[PDB]
């Protein structure tokens, strides 16, 4: 079994999809190991987005994650990592994401993607330590 | 943002899926700009199906759209055109349409496809003028 | 069988519940006889609210129905009138409306009631003539 | 607007209803002000259940809340208190709770009630201070 | 724990509600102990409806249960009997049944009630022996 | 129109998905021709899994199908065979099955696949004779 970090971003909250997203995870058979509505410091935001740190969309990327609170969580279970990304869909909700996924069903813009899921074991271990340093 | 024409055909109505379809559109983040249950004249039907005007399935194609009332609508929003076709699925509901789409979830026959969505900007502009000449 | 007028007010639209409401109606076994997204003139609004014409909440009552478009419809079927009001719930969504109803599930304020349904045969016949004078 | 404390108890979690419950809250128009999966100390449990402190069911009442983690939350909005209790249903899910409520739809036992909601302004203010002393 | 007999009548099947009904039962926490789509002999129908044997609606009552196949089942769990009747709603779907129940959400006529649930321990034991004499 | 055999395996039952699965079938427009919760003899299990009779996973394959009761059914309609497999998804729920399918939405393991659907006309005719020799 694996552990992956999941974020429900400020747009997912504005659109009232916290429970919808969590439900899909639960229904897949995965288990919520940690869960917390929290605010994001300027520091955390950048450390999170270091992969795309130096790039054209960095600015508004941080301003976004910091505009309102977010819901962070540790999702655990068999193939947690791949499964979550499976539920989430591709980055582009119209041309990439399949219908039935979170982004595929609710999203229209690459930017406002509603959700985040660790893209690899390497990332997951790094992001969990980052958002849930205690646990 | 774009505007696209959407039809909920007589079979979509017989099967009580008006609200189900509209909901999926709404949930995607798209907005219903126009909406009307209406009947179809012989003329409108053919002007609509002019693309496939001369073909083997034209007859019953018109007889169908004219058998009962239909629900016409203008759907507006970011990438309205592609998104709607994304929600609708491919023409063949079993071999083409993905599960999660409208046709993929409810349809079994290429003919009885429940729904219509403009396939391009060129078409949308033409079909909207056709169904909602005022608006 | 009966005919009743149903309104999905501007708040029902802002909250993306057109399809949700229509679906509940469909699922009850009732049939959408007429349906149209339309704007409301100052005149229509008052003629509609004549029952509560002279009262303390009249002003903002009209300003509301006229702030954005609404979805009007004629719902037909066995006991259409009572059934629709059954689905809609009592006027106060928290103290009157039962869970499971439209207002009971989605509403919090007596004012923002999302929906309207004719309260009697007398009213229905009057309101249908008013909103769908042709049909 | 009001603030009320909501608990999703260990049975609500075992039965995979976190998102289902949160969704119902969201859909009612209420907003999640705080949210956290957390464990319960022996002390917190009793301070929470002081109202029924001296009684026949106290023992297993505490042992339960402490058997696994729970999801605590602050729910905010118009009539937050009454509305939440409205969504939750009466204590007895079969004879009291109406269909459509959380308990009414999912529960069978008075003990395993899935959810908790502050029963009054007095309680809410006390329980929020208790579970979210910071916020 | 108790055992109760549940019938999904021919109208429940025509309206594609087998899974919807079963789901509601499952979700309540009850368990399907037996389940079978079967036809009804003239004899079984009357033995079932002996309570209302001599009455004005007996004829079409039997003709109905015998018009198409039905889905019979034994539902088991805590307060199975009351809970099932709770999910089913009162006999009259508009004036008696609450929204959120099966009849309350889908039915319009006292006759076409979609579902049946044993009304008492005495009945349950009698009807189970009748429909599932082996089990 | 075609006939296909569908199994809801013991894990589909443990996870309370009987009605969910049946519903998806119904909603696709397919019809339940036969349906029965039943136990599986050692013989039936192997005759069913003869295709993969001689293989590394045979043992626990039979032990599984025989651990608890299962729900067998004959599903009938246009392209019943392909459609059902379409609803079910690929064998591997994470890497193969698309979101929106049964396995895609609920499953995490190739072994615990919740459902079975005949993979061909040849198989269907053979498996129906096997599970429903009378009908």
Residue numbers in the entry:
A (entry chain A), B (entry chain A), C (entry chain A), D (entry chain A), E (entry chain A), F (entry chain A): 2 to 136
The authors write:
Nucleoside diphosphate kinases (NDPKs) catalyze the reversible transfer of the phosphoryl γ of nucleoside triphosphates to nucleoside diphosphates.
One interaction present in Mt-NDPK but missing in other NDPKs, is the intersubunit salt bridge Arg80-Asp93 located on the protein surface. The aspartate was changed to asparagine since many NDPKs have asparagine in that position. The D93N mutant crystallizes along two different space groups. The two structures are similar (0.40 Å of rmsd for 135 Cα) and differ only slightly in the conformation of αA and α2 helices due to crystal contacts. The overall B-factor values of the two D93N structures (64 Å2 and 71 Å2) are similar and higher than that of the wild type (31 Å2). The D93N mutant enzymes displayed catalytic properties very similar to those of the wt enzyme, within experimental errors. Replacement of the Asp93 with the neutral asparagine showed a dramatically decrease of the thermal stability. The chemical denaturation studies with urea and GuHCl as denaturants showed a large decrease in hexamer stability as a result of the D93N mutation, while the stability of the isolated subunit was not affected.
